[PDB]
mmCIF file of C-alpha atoms in Angstrom:
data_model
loop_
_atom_site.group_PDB
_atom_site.id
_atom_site.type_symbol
_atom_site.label_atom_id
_atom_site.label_comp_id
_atom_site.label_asym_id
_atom_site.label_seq_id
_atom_site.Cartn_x
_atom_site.Cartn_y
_atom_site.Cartn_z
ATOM 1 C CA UNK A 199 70.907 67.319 101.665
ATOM 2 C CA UNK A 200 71.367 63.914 99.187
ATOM 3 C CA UNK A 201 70.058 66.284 96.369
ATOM 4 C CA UNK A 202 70.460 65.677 92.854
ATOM 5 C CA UNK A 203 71.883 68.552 91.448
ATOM 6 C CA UNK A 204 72.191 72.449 93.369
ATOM 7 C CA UNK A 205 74.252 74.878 91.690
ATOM 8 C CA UNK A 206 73.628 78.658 90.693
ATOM 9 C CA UNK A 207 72.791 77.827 87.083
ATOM 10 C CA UNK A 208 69.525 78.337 87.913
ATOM 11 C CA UNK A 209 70.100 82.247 88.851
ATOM 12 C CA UNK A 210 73.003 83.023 86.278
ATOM 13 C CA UNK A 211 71.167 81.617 83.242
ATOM 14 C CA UNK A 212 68.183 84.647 84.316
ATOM 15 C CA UNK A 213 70.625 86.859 84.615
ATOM 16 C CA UNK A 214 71.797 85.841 81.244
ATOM 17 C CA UNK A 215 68.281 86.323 79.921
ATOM 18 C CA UNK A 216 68.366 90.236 82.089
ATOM 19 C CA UNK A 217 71.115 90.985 80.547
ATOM 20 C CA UNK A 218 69.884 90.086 76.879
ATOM 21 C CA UNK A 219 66.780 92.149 77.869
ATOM 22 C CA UNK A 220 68.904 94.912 78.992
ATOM 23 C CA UNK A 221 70.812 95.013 76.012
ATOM 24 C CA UNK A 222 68.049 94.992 73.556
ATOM 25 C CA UNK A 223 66.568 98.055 75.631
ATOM 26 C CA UNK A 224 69.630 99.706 75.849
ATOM 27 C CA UNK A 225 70.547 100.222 72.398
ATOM 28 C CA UNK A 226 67.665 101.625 70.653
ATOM 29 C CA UNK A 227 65.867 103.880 73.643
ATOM 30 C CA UNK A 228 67.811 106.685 75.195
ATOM 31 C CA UNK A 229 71.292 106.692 74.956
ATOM 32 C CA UNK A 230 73.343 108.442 72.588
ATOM 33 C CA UNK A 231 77.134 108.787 73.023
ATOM 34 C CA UNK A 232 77.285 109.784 76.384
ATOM 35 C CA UNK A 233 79.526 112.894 76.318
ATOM 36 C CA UNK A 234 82.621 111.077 77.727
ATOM 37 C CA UNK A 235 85.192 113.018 75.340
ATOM 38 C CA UNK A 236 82.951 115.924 74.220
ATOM 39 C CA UNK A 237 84.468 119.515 73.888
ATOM 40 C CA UNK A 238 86.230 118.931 70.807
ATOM 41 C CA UNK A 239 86.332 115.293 70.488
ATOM 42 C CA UNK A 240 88.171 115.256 67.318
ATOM 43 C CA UNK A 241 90.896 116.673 69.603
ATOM 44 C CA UNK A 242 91.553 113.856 71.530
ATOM 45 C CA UNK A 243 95.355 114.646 71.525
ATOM 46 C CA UNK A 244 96.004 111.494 71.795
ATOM 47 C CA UNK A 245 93.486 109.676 74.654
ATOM 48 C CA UNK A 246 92.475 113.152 75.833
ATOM 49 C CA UNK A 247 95.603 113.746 78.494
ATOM 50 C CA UNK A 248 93.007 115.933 80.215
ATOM 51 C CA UNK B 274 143.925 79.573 122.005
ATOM 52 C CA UNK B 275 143.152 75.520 120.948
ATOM 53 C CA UNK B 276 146.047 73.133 121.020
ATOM 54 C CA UNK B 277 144.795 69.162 120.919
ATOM 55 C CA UNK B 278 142.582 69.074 117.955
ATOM 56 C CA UNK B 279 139.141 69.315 119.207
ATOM 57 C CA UNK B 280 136.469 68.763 117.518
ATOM 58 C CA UNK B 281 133.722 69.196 120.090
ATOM 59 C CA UNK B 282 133.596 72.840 120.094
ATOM 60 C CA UNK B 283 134.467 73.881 116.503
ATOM 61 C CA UNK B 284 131.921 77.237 114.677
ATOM 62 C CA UNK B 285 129.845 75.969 112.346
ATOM 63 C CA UNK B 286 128.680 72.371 113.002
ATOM 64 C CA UNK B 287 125.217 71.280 111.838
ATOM 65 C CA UNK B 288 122.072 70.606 113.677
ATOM 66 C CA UNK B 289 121.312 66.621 112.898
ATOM 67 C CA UNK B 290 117.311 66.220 113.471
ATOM 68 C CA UNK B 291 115.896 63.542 114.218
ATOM 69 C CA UNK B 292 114.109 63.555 110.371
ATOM 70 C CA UNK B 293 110.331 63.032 111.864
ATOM 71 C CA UNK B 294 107.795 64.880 113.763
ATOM 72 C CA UNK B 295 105.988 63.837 116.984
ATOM 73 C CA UNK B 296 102.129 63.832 117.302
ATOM 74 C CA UNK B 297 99.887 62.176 119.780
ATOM 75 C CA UNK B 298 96.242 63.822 118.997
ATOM 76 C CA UNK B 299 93.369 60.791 119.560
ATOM 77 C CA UNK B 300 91.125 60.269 116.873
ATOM 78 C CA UNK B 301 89.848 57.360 117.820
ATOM 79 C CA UNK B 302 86.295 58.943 117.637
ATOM 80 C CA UNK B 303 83.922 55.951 119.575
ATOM 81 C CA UNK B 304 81.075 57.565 118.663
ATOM 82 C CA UNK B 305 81.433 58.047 115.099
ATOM 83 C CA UNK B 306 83.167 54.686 114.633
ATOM 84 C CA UNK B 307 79.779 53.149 115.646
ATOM 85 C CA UNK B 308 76.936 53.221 112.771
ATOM 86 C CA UNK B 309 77.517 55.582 110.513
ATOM 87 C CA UNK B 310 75.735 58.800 108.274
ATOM 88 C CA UNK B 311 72.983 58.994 106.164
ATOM 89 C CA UNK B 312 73.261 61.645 103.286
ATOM 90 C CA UNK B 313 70.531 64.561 103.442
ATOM 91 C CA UNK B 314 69.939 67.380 100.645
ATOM 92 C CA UNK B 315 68.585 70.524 103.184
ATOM 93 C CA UNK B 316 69.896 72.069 106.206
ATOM 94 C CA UNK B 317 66.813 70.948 108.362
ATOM 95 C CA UNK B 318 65.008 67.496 108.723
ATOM 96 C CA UNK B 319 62.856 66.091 110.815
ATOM 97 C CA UNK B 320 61.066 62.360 112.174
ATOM 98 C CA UNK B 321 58.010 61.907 113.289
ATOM 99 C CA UNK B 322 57.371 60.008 116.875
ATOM 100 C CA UNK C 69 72.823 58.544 113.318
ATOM 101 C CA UNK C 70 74.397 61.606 111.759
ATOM 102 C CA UNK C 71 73.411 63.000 109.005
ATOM 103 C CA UNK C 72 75.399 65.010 106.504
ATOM 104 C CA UNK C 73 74.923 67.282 103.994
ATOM 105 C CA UNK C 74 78.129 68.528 102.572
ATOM 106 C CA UNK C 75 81.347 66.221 103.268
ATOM 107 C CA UNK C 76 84.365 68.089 104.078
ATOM 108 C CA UNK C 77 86.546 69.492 101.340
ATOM 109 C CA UNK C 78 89.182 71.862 101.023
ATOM 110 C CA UNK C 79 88.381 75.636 99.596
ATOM 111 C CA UNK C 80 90.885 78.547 98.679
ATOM 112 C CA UNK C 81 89.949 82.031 99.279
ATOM 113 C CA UNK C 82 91.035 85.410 98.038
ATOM 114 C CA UNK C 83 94.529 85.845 98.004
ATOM 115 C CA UNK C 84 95.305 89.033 99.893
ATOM 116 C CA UNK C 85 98.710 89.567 98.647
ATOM 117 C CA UNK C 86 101.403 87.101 100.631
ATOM 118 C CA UNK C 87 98.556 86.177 102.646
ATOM 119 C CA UNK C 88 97.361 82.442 100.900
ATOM 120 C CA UNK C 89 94.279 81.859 103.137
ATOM 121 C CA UNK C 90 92.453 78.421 103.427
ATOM 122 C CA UNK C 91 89.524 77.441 104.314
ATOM 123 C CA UNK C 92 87.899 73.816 105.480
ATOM 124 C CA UNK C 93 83.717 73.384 106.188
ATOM 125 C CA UNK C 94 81.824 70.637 107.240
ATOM 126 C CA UNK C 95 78.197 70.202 107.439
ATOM 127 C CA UNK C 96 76.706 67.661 109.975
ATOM 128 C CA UNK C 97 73.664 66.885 111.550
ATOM 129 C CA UNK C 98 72.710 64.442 114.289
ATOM 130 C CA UNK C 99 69.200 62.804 114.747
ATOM 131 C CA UNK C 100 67.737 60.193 117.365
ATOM 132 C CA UNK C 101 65.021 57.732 116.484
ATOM 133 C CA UNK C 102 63.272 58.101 119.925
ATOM 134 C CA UNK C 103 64.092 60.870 122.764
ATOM 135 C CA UNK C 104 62.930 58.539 125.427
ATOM 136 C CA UNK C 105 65.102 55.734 123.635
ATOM 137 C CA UNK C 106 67.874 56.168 125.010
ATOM 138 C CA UNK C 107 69.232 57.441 128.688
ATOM 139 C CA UNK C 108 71.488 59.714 130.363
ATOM 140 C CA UNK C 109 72.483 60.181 133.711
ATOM 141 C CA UNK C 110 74.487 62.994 135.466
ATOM 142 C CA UNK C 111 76.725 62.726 138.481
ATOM 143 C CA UNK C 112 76.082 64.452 141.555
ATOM 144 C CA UNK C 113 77.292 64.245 145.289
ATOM 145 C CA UNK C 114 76.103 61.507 147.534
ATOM 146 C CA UNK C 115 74.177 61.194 151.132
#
């Protein structure tokens, strides 16, 4: 409606900023290499066929 | 079976279109020819009476 | 009057896979200085 300017800049750049937040969280507070290749993980066999 | 070199009824002739298309939708739009829009920035507006 | 808020344009869409969808919107609105302005009259049978 003859407005000057409406695009969703306004809600990606605070997702931007969420995810910034997120990230600083993220890395120092719980997580700890989630056991994605654990029993053995030295024996990947190469990429863990399993 | 043919004898006197005809032409008329021979397999594999072509279809020779006319080249153009046809279309008679009116758009002559009265209405809308008359005074035209004015640009708004929301879905609703109003005017006061 | 008419007013507008978007003028027509042409959009693509997801693809689909051999599908190639399109899309055209238009957003209009209409607005009347005075109701009582102008008149209308429907038709009807006589006598």
């Amino acid at each position: 409606n003859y407005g000057r300017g409406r695009e969703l800049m306004y809600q990606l750049e605070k997702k931007g900023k969420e995810i910034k937040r997120d990230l600083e969280k993220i890395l120092l507070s719980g997580q700890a290499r989630t056991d994605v290749l654990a029993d053995q993980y030295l024996t990947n066999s190469a990429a863990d066929p399993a | 079976n043919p004898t006197l070199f005809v032409s008329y009824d021979q397999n594999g002739k072509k279809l020779s279109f006319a080249n153009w298309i046809s279309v008679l939708s009116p758009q002559d739009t009265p209405f809308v020819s008359m005074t035209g829009k004015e640009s708004i920035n929301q879905t609703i507006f109003s005017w006061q009476t | 009057t008419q007013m507008v808020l978007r003028a027509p344009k042409r959009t693509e869409l997801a693809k689909d896979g051999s599908y190639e969808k399109w899309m055209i919107e238009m957003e209009v609105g209409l607005r009347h200085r005075n109701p009582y302005a102008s008149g209308v009259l429907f038709t009807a049978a006589g006598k």
